[PDB]
Design a protein around this ligand. Sequence first.
Ligand SMILES: *[C@@H]1O[C@H](CO)[C@@H](O[C@@H]2O[C@H](CO)[C@@H](O[C@@H]3O[C@H](CO[C@H]4O[C@H](CO)[C@@H](O)[C@H](O)[C@@H]4O[C@H]4O[C@H](CO)[C@@H](O)[C@H](O)[C@@H]4O)[C@@H](O)[C@H](O[C@H]4O[C@H](CO)[C@@H](O)[C@H](O)[C@@H]4O[C@H]4O[C@H](CO)[C@@H](O)[C@H](O)[C@@H]4O)[C@@H]3O)[C@H](O)[C@H]2NC(C)=O)[C@H](O)[C@H]1NC(C)=O
Ligand SMILES: *[C@@H]1O[C@H](CO)[C@@H](O[C@@H]2O[C@H](CO)[C@@H](O[C@@H]3O[C@H](CO[C@H]4O[C@H](CO)[C@@H](O)[C@H](O)[C@@H]4O[C@H]4O[C@H](CO)[C@@H](O)[C@H](O)[C@@H]4O)[C@@H](O)[C@H](O[C@H]4O[C@H](CO)[C@@H](O)[C@H](O)[C@@H]4O[C@H]4O[C@H](CO)[C@@H](O)[C@H](O)[C@@H]4O)[C@@H]3O)[C@H](O)[C@H]2NC(C)=O)[C@H](O)[C@H]1NC(C)=O
Ligand SMILES: *[C@@H]1O[C@H](CO)[C@@H](O[C@@H]2O[C@H](CO)[C@@H](O[C@@H]3O[C@H](CO)[C@@H](O)[C@H](O)[C@@H]3O)[C@H](O)[C@H]2NC(C)=O)[C@H](O)[C@H]1NC(C)=O
Ligand SMILES: *[C@@H]1O[C@H](CO)[C@@H](O[C@@H]2O[C@H](CO)[C@@H](O[C@@H]3O[C@H](CO)[C@@H](O)[C@H](O)[C@@H]3O)[C@H](O)[C@H]2NC(C)=O)[C@H](O)[C@H]1NC(C)=O
Ligand SMILES: *[C@@H]1O[C@H](CO)[C@@H](O[C@@H]2O[C@H](CO)[C@@H](O[C@@H]3O[C@H](CO)[C@@H](O)[C@H](O)[C@@H]3O)[C@H](O)[C@H]2NC(C)=O)[C@H](O)[C@H]1NC(C)=O
Ligand SMILES: *[C@@H]1O[C@H](CO)[C@@H](O[C@@H]2O[C@H](CO)[C@@H](O)[C@H](O)[C@H]2NC(C)=O)[C@H](O)[C@H]1NC(C)=O
Ligand SMILES: *[C@@H]1O[C@H](CO)[C@@H](O)[C@H](O)[C@H]1NC(C)=O
Ligand SMILES: *[C@@H]1O[C@H](CO)[C@@H](O)[C@H](O)[C@H]1NC(C)=O
Ligand SMILES: *[C@@H]1O[C@H](CO)[C@@H](O)[C@H](O)[C@H]1NC(C)=O
Ligand SMILES: *[C@@H]1O[C@H](CO)[C@@H](O)[C@H](O)[C@H]1NC(C)=O
Ligand SMILES: *[C@@H]1O[C@H](CO)[C@@H](O)[C@H](O)[C@H]1NC(C)=O
Ligand SMILES: *[C@@H]1O[C@H](CO)[C@@H](O)[C@H](O)[C@H]1NC(C)=O
Ligand SMILES: *[C@@H]1O[C@H](CO)[C@@H](O)[C@H](O)[C@H]1NC(C)=O
Ligand SMILES: *[C@@H]1O[C@H](CO)[C@@H](O)[C@H](O)[C@H]1NC(C)=O
Ligand SMILES: *[C@@H]1O[C@H](CO)[C@@H](O)[C@H](O)[C@H]1NC(C)=O
Ligand SMILES: *[C@@H]1O[C@H](CO)[C@@H](O)[C@H](O)[C@H]1NC(C)=O
Ligand SMILES: *[C@@H]1O[C@H](CO)[C@@H](O)[C@H](O)[C@H]1NC(C)=O
Ligand SMILES: *[C@@H]1O[C@H](CO)[C@@H](O)[C@H](O)[C@H]1NC(C)=O
Ligand SMILES: *[C@@H]1O[C@H](CO)[C@@H](O)[C@H](O)[C@H]1NC(C)=O
Ligand SMILES: *[C@@H]1O[C@H](CO)[C@@H](O)[C@H](O)[C@H]1NC(C)=O
Ligand SMILES: *[C@@H]1O[C@H](CO)[C@@H](O)[C@H](O)[C@H]1NC(C)=O
Ligand SMILES: *[C@@H]1O[C@H](CO)[C@@H](O)[C@H](O)[C@H]1NC(C)=O
Ligand SMILES: *[C@@H]1O[C@H](CO)[C@@H](O)[C@H](O)[C@H]1NC(C)=O
Ligand SMILES: *[C@@H]1O[C@H](CO)[C@@H](O)[C@H](O)[C@H]1NC(C)=O
Ligand SMILES: *[C@@H]1O[C@H](CO)[C@@H](O)[C@H](O)[C@H]1NC(C)=O
Ligand SMILES: *[C@@H]1O[C@H](CO)[C@@H](O)[C@H](O)[C@H]1NC(C)=O
Lengths: 49, 957, 97
Amino acid sequence: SDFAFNNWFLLTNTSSVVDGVVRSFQPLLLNCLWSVSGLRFTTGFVYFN
Amino acid sequence: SDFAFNNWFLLTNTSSVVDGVVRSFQPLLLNCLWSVSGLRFTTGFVYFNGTGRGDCKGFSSDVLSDVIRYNLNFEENLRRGTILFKTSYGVVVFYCTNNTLVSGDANFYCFVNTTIGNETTSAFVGALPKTVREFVISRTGHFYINGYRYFTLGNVEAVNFNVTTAETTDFCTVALASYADVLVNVSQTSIANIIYCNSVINRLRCDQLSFDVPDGFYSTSPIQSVELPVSIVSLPVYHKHTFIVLYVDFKPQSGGGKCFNCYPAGVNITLANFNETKGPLCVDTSHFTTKYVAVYANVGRWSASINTGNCPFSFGKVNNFVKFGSVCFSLKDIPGGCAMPIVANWAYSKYYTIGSLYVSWSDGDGITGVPQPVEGVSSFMNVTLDKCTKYNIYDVSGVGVIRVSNDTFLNGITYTSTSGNLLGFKDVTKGTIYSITPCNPPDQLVVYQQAVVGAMLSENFTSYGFSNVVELPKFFYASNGTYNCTDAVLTYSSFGVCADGSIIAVQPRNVSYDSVSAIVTANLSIPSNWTTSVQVEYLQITSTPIVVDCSTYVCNGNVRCVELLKQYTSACKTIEDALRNSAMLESADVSEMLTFDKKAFTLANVSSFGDYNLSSVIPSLPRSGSRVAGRSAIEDILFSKLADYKKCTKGLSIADLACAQYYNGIMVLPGVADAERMAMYTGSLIGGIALGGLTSAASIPFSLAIQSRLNYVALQTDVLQENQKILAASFNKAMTNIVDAFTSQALQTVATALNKIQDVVNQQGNSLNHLTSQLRQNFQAISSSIQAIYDRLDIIQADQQVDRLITGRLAALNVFVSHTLTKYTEVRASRQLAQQKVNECVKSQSKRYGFCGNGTHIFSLVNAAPEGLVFLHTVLLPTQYKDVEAWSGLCVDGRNGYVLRQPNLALYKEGNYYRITSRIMFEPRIPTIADFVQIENCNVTFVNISRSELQTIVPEY
Amino acid sequence: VSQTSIANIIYCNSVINRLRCDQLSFDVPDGFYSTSPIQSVELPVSIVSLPVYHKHTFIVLYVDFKPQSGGGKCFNCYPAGVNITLANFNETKGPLC
Ligand SMILES: *[C@@H]1O[C@H](CO)[C@@H](O[C@@H]2O[C@H](CO)[C@@H](O[C@@H]3O[C@H](CO[C@H]4O[C@H](CO)[C@@H](O)[C@H](O)[C@@H]4O[C@H]4O[C@H](CO)[C@@H](O)[C@H](O)[C@@H]4O)[C@@H](O)[C@H](O[C@H]4O[C@H](CO)[C@@H](O)[C@H](O)[C@@H]4O[C@H]4O[C@H](CO)[C@@H](O)[C@H](O)[C@@H]4O)[C@@H]3O)[C@H](O)[C@H]2NC(C)=O)[C@H](O)[C@H]1NC(C)=O
Ligand SMILES: *[C@@H]1O[C@H](CO)[C@@H](O[C@@H]2O[C@H](CO)[C@@H](O[C@@H]3O[C@H](CO[C@H]4O[C@H](CO)[C@@H](O)[C@H](O)[C@@H]4O[C@H]4O[C@H](CO)[C@@H](O)[C@H](O)[C@@H]4O)[C@@H](O)[C@H](O[C@H]4O[C@H](CO)[C@@H](O)[C@H](O)[C@@H]4O[C@H]4O[C@H](CO)[C@@H](O)[C@H](O)[C@@H]4O)[C@@H]3O)[C@H](O)[C@H]2NC(C)=O)[C@H](O)[C@H]1NC(C)=O
Ligand SMILES: *[C@@H]1O[C@H](CO)[C@@H](O[C@@H]2O[C@H](CO)[C@@H](O[C@@H]3O[C@H](CO)[C@@H](O)[C@H](O)[C@@H]3O)[C@H](O)[C@H]2NC(C)=O)[C@H](O)[C@H]1NC(C)=O
Ligand SMILES: *[C@@H]1O[C@H](CO)[C@@H](O[C@@H]2O[C@H](CO)[C@@H](O[C@@H]3O[C@H](CO)[C@@H](O)[C@H](O)[C@@H]3O)[C@H](O)[C@H]2NC(C)=O)[C@H](O)[C@H]1NC(C)=O
Ligand SMILES: *[C@@H]1O[C@H](CO)[C@@H](O[C@@H]2O[C@H](CO)[C@@H](O[C@@H]3O[C@H](CO)[C@@H](O)[C@H](O)[C@@H]3O)[C@H](O)[C@H]2NC(C)=O)[C@H](O)[C@H]1NC(C)=O
Ligand SMILES: *[C@@H]1O[C@H](CO)[C@@H](O[C@@H]2O[C@H](CO)[C@@H](O)[C@H](O)[C@H]2NC(C)=O)[C@H](O)[C@H]1NC(C)=O
Ligand SMILES: *[C@@H]1O[C@H](CO)[C@@H](O)[C@H](O)[C@H]1NC(C)=O
Ligand SMILES: *[C@@H]1O[C@H](CO)[C@@H](O)[C@H](O)[C@H]1NC(C)=O
Ligand SMILES: *[C@@H]1O[C@H](CO)[C@@H](O)[C@H](O)[C@H]1NC(C)=O
Ligand SMILES: *[C@@H]1O[C@H](CO)[C@@H](O)[C@H](O)[C@H]1NC(C)=O
Ligand SMILES: *[C@@H]1O[C@H](CO)[C@@H](O)[C@H](O)[C@H]1NC(C)=O
Ligand SMILES: *[C@@H]1O[C@H](CO)[C@@H](O)[C@H](O)[C@H]1NC(C)=O
Ligand SMILES: *[C@@H]1O[C@H](CO)[C@@H](O)[C@H](O)[C@H]1NC(C)=O
Ligand SMILES: *[C@@H]1O[C@H](CO)[C@@H](O)[C@H](O)[C@H]1NC(C)=O
Ligand SMILES: *[C@@H]1O[C@H](CO)[C@@H](O)[C@H](O)[C@H]1NC(C)=O
Ligand SMILES: *[C@@H]1O[C@H](CO)[C@@H](O)[C@H](O)[C@H]1NC(C)=O
Ligand SMILES: *[C@@H]1O[C@H](CO)[C@@H](O)[C@H](O)[C@H]1NC(C)=O
Ligand SMILES: *[C@@H]1O[C@H](CO)[C@@H](O)[C@H](O)[C@H]1NC(C)=O
Ligand SMILES: *[C@@H]1O[C@H](CO)[C@@H](O)[C@H](O)[C@H]1NC(C)=O
Ligand SMILES: *[C@@H]1O[C@H](CO)[C@@H](O)[C@H](O)[C@H]1NC(C)=O
Ligand SMILES: *[C@@H]1O[C@H](CO)[C@@H](O)[C@H](O)[C@H]1NC(C)=O
Ligand SMILES: *[C@@H]1O[C@H](CO)[C@@H](O)[C@H](O)[C@H]1NC(C)=O
Ligand SMILES: *[C@@H]1O[C@H](CO)[C@@H](O)[C@H](O)[C@H]1NC(C)=O
Ligand SMILES: *[C@@H]1O[C@H](CO)[C@@H](O)[C@H](O)[C@H]1NC(C)=O
Ligand SMILES: *[C@@H]1O[C@H](CO)[C@@H](O)[C@H](O)[C@H]1NC(C)=O
Ligand SMILES: *[C@@H]1O[C@H](CO)[C@@H](O)[C@H](O)[C@H]1NC(C)=O
């Protein structure tokens, strides 16, 4: 809790709602905390693993 | 205006209405005034041109005439005539022979023969009219005699009228005309007058389906009706095209010599995309422009073209911003797919189709038809800014105007309202966003004395010819008159409008009232002689019960329908059971409320009253009939200002509207409040005023009675009673004033009651006026007529499409019953209140403030009215006040202080002597010792008097 | 969401959170609510029919697409796609019911 997540966005095929309360399905599993710290051009191939 | 137009008729394909008000499209353009004056047999050929040998009068544009109307003014005699119609395909003539022989004379036989090219054909007139008063024809070829249309010819290039009349006063008119939108008033199916829908005020009037709309507020939307610039916006992706083109090359050998619909040299029609394997060709690149392609060399009068099929999307419009998941267009048949037919016409007379374009499709967002043929690596995003336009933005279409805004809103790309209409969008390029305001928001306008005045708007502009647009909070307002604030002729809670349209802020009702008169041993004022007034109220008392027959209403007499319904008797029983039980309940109540007194009914004779002359209220005597009573004057005036089935199975008249309802199955029961016992009740109540408890049964003068009622408020103490004689002159005058008002706030009160009565009557009628209309529409069935449904189908698939009718009808019926119960359960409250106040005010003066009138109450009259009562609360209002100087108590020389036995009295020093008066009237009463009471502790604030001068005030000793 | 931008979220895991999310709000006022907790797994299947000694009919179809790979020229070209049929066809070929 208290995470700003300013960059983090919703996902919608249709027109986005504004300033509302909505329950929905989102891809929000923490999974790997970062997994990209110090990202460089040779990021390698990750395949849903 | 004022044109009789007795011959002139309506035009209707379907059954004609009778004696109604209807707005419709009619060919009523004056065009050439006459154009046929002095008509002779050589009338010539006129072809929808100004080439008419007549006085046009110069009001005729002479551009074109959609239709030709012939008006005949001849005696009712038969005169030889012929009709010639000229068309490019053929010439058709109409002839009739009076004599029996087919040739007859140049038993009546009429033959119309039509010849095309060198071929001559013979046609059969069949039915021949006894008399024809009007003739109608049109360019489309519709043929109308006396309004109805017998048949429609394919086309008419020109019309020639072969009518020969020896009479010099041959006929009245043969003219040309054009369509227009008008309104009409019809009596006995015959026109009376019309109203052109051109001006704004006339537009509103026609919209009202009436004339003379009452002064008030209405809403209107003025809309532009012209082409507007078109704007498009899509996501930029470098266009990769796909062209689907088809090469129909009908090229027959003319087809007019043997057959056009025989498909000669009709053969190959194909598009290059067919595969030797002939797998269905579905495009892959999203952007494709479908086009019809070139057409075969075209010869005169005939053509071929594509027709709309059964698919959702019409071919040719597909390119107009459509979506698809997989086109898969194929030339041969495709399993489970829609197909379209191409047909050819020979002068719009032969129709021959060809199996063409099997298409099946999946829905999707990848493929999209684009109108613009050019597709490539280019930059385009046309966007007109500040005008009304069409638009397509990211596959959403509409019309409106675009406004630049300043809002970051980088979360997404499209914003839509709760309704589903988009509000604004953001450009992909930069980040600016634009709103989409609608072109024509509704405007609120006002009308008064059958002309428009003033207007509530949204834009700071003078849309109409109004000369001023006063900005006001929450809205703008136009007006054409100066502001002088003289008065208001219309009003709403916030504000009222002037006669010329000037707006004014309302000042609430200046009034004044009274309150407790605290004893303070100081100057105070008591009310003097009053003046009379009358207030009117109205109470709803009853509702006209209605009953319904389930099986008639839905079955409508079909035995098979009745049998399919037979399994639903569990359902519809509840409806009629509820309606019937509620009706008998309420009728029992209203019959329990109405009492009667023969002792007092006789007293209603006007001779018993006196100067009051309440002639209107008293019931009328029987008109040489054995009827107990007759309605009073205010009664028939009210009814004036506002059938037997015995004649609905028998008789020679056409059925009336009410009669029709019985046939359908609704049935309005006779009203509970019948006039006989209603009038007896009202008369008995009125006679209960002049009757007082006496050993004998005789009456006493009405004057004494009022005095007694006054005593209730306080002990009237005067011997020469000026009030009895003064108030009557105001009373009878007020009554004459108010009956004139029927035929000063009291006036607005009467206006409110009248408005309420017409309100309840409209509210009652339009309920079943809404009910009986819903069976005319078929929810999902082929047609409403059950009998027709049985005719059109066999036993297995007829009942299946039948039952969905009754499945809807029962729902509508359950809605109706559930709203009738909600009318009864609420009117019961008004009944409670009415019975609660009639027995209170009508019988015994109330001491409750504000229940019987503005001020102190003396007596109240009652009369009947449609489904309700009306009261006449006579009251008293203070003309002037008399001031006086008082003392809050008394102190004897001894410690004891005296006070009064009840508060409503008050001492004062009238002169040398002291007089104690009532608090509510200026009547004075003598002092005495019995009117006081003792309390030890003396307050100095009271009169200070010793035992000596006590003997001077009260004779103690 | 404020100005189309996220502010905070609530995982719908606990029973109380489940009810709260169902309320389309936060902090539902103290009171009474109704809920249905439902099993979400496969359950044994039971059948019952009128006993009649079963006489069978087998309808079987033999689609044998077998194309020559299809990745070198075309897969949707129906190569060696041909015969797909079920033994029940009649020389008269009356519909088989
Ligand atoms: C924009 O529009 C696009 C349109 O495509 C939207 O994308 C679609 O979004 C829907 C909804 O999220 C999505 O359906 C879901 O798919 C995922 C993945 O499916 C595979 O995972 C399941 C396991 O969950 C595996 O069994 C299998 O690999 C699934 O694939 C199969 O899908 C069906 C159903 O499972 C199978 O029968 C097929 O054979 C196929 O192989 C699923 O996670 C999700 O599954 C949920 O519902 C199903 C059906 O009731 C259920 O069986 C699952 O168990 C699960 O239900 C609940 O179970 C989890 C257990 O952890 C529990 O935590 C939750 O309660 C779950 O709800 C469902 O099938 C669809 O695939 C997307 N489209 C495509 C083509 O990918 C996009 O979301 C839109 N974006 C917005 C919102 O704007
Ligand atoms: C009995 O039943 C018969 C059944 O056939 C009824 O006959 C039909 O009546 C309807 C309604 O009147 C009639 O539709 C009207 O046709 C006339 C003539 O059409 C031609 O004129 C227009 C110009 O107005 C030209 O553009 C062109 O020549 C028209 O022909 C074309 O029709 C459509 C639409 O225009 C075209 O797309 C086709 O390509 C075809 O060539 C029209 O005057 C009338 O047009 C009005 O509506 C259209 C469509 O919205 C609009 O585009 C027009 O501008 C016009 O709308 C308004 O514009 C005028 C401008 O002066 C304005 O003053 C009014 O507000 C207009 O309303 C419409 O198309 C139909 O053709 C008749 N049937 C046939 C086959 O002829 C008969 O009326 C019934 N009788 C009753 C009442 O019982
Ligand atoms: C709608 O059309 C009807 C039919 O013309 C109009 O009603 C007719 O109105 C006239 C007056 O406009 C009535 O005449 C008056 O009748 C009385 C009683 O007979 C007579 O004493 C008067 O001297 C005068 O003739 C006529 O009775 C009436 N007829 C019918 C059948 O209604 C109606 O006014 C029209 N309304 C509009 C808004 O155009
Ligand atoms: C009961 O209601 C009626 C009508 O609302 C009241 O009648 C009116 O009483 C007011 C006093 O509140 C009178 O006002 C004054 O009139 C004089 C003379 O014109 C004027 O000089 C004053 O400045 C003030 O306007 C008004 O004339 C009178 N109108 C009528 C038609 O009678 C009545 O007073 C109400 N009674 C109570 C107890 O509220
Ligand atoms: C739903 O999301 C909105 C957006 O964040 C929440 O509203 C925001 O709530 C904060 C406090 O949680 C408000 O801040 C307070 O505002 C006042 C007045 O400016 C200020 O004096 C306080 O110090 C504090 O900053 C903020 O105004 C408000 N903004 C908006 C646009 O609503 C809302 O509370 C969230 N609700 C839930 C249940 O998560
Ligand atoms: C509203 O005001 C306008 C002008 O302020 C009035 O207009 C005149 O109307 C006649 C009749 O159409 C025209 O011949 C004049 O040219 C108009 N004058 C102007 C300056 O436009 C109009 O009559 C007024 N209408 C009402 C109902 O008040
Ligand atoms: C990423 O692309 C760059 C050129 O844009 C290239 O030099 C580099 O090798 C690429 N990275 C990998 C891991 O191949
Ligand atoms: C991911 O892990 C699974 C399980 O070991 C494995 O099958 C798969 O090959 C891994 N991913 C890749 C890209 O190899
Ligand atoms: C009209 O018909 C009559 C015969 O009925 C014919 O004598 C006359 O010539 C016709 N009129 C014209 C203009 O041809
Ligand atoms: C009617 O006038 C138009 C315009 O001049 C013309 O094209 C047409 O030919 C005229 N009518 C006839 C029957 O010639
Ligand atoms: C009917 O048609 C026949 C054959 O074309 C023709 O001889 C006859 O005059 C027609 N009848 C008329 C024009 O009344
Ligand atoms: C109707 O016909 C008569 C016949 O003499 C004529 O006098 C009168 O003017 C005509 N009325 C019209 C055409 O309105
Ligand atoms: C189609 O038919 C026409 C005439 O039968 C012929 O000219 C044309 O070559 C045919 N084929 C195509 C592809 O148009
Ligand atoms: C779109 O904009 C271009 C540039 O002015 C113009 O040539 C073209 O006609 C416009 N298209 C439409 C449909 O107005
Ligand atoms: C920007 O937008 C805000 C609110 O949408 C508005 O108050 C302001 O006037 C706009 N213009 C500027 C220059 O801030
Ligand atoms: C409204 O119109 C009047 C007309 O002169 C003008 O003076 C005023 O500035 C306008 N106000 C607005 C907000 O447009
Ligand atoms: C009407 O206006 C005139 C001129 O402005 C003024 O003299 C007069 O007092 C006004 N009268 C009313 C009743 O508003
Ligand atoms: C009604 O009330 C207003 C409110 O200020 C007052 O100015 C005015 O004297 C009153 N007018 C009448 C006719 O009572
Ligand atoms: C009011 O009371 C005072 C006593 O202080 C008295 O002098 C005066 O005359 C009284 N006013 C009237 C009008 O009698
Ligand atoms: C009240 O009484 C006085 C004196 O008797 C009289 O002059 C006045 O006209 C009366 N007013 C009314 C309304 O009766
Ligand atoms: C009213 O009473 C008088 C005598 O008291 C009598 O002549 C008259 O008939 C009565 N009126 C009625 C309607 O009975
Ligand atoms: C008084 O009574 C007579 C009797 O009919 C009636 O004509 C007259 O109109 C009445 N006057 C008033 C003011 O009620
Ligand atoms: C004719 O019809 C009218 C009304 O429809 C009716 O009153 C009358 O009795 C009928 N019979 C005769 C002979 O008038
Ligand atoms: C009693 O007299 C006193 C004298 O100061 C006064 O203030 C008070 O109001 C009086 N109380 C009464 C009359 O009840
Ligand atoms: C009346 O009141 C005066 C004023 O206080 C007081 O001096 C006097 O004693 C009183 N007289 C009585 C109570 O008799
Ligand atoms: C169907 O087709 C396949 C391959 O074309 C073949 O092996 C088989 O014999 C054919 N007939 C039947 C009945 O399967």
